[PDB]
């Protein structure tokens, strides 16, 4: 669920009793978009080229 109320940004992800929790967070980083790779490419017009 979400619990954002203009005092931050809260997304609660409840963990089951039979689960480590840290392993779930590592899986979420690996699979989900919580970790994203920003591909830097510094191209700009210098002297109009």
Partner DNA sequence: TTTTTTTTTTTTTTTTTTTTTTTTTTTTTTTTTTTTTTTTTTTTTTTTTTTTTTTTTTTTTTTTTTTTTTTTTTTTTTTTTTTTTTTTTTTTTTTTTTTTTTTTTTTTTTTTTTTTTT
Is 37 among the residues that bind DNA (CB under 7 A)? yes
| Residue 24 CB coordination number (10 Å) | 13
Smallest distance, DNA to C-beta of residue 2, A = 19
**What does the DSSP 8-state code read for residue 47?**
S
Longest dimension (CA), the chain: 62
CB 12 within 8 A of CB 1: yes
Shortest Cβ 6–DNA spacing (Å): 22
Report the residue from 9, 11, 22, 39 that binds DNA according to the rule CB under 7 A.
39
Please say which residue, 19 or 23, places its beta carbon nearer to DNA.
19
């Amino acid at each position: 669920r979400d619990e954002s109320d203009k005092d931050g940004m809260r997304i609660v992800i409840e963990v089951k009793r039979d689960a480590v929790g840290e392993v779930v967070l590592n899986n979420l980083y690996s699979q989900t978009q919580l970790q994203v790779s920003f591909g830097i490419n510094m191209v700009a017009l210098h002297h109009g080229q």
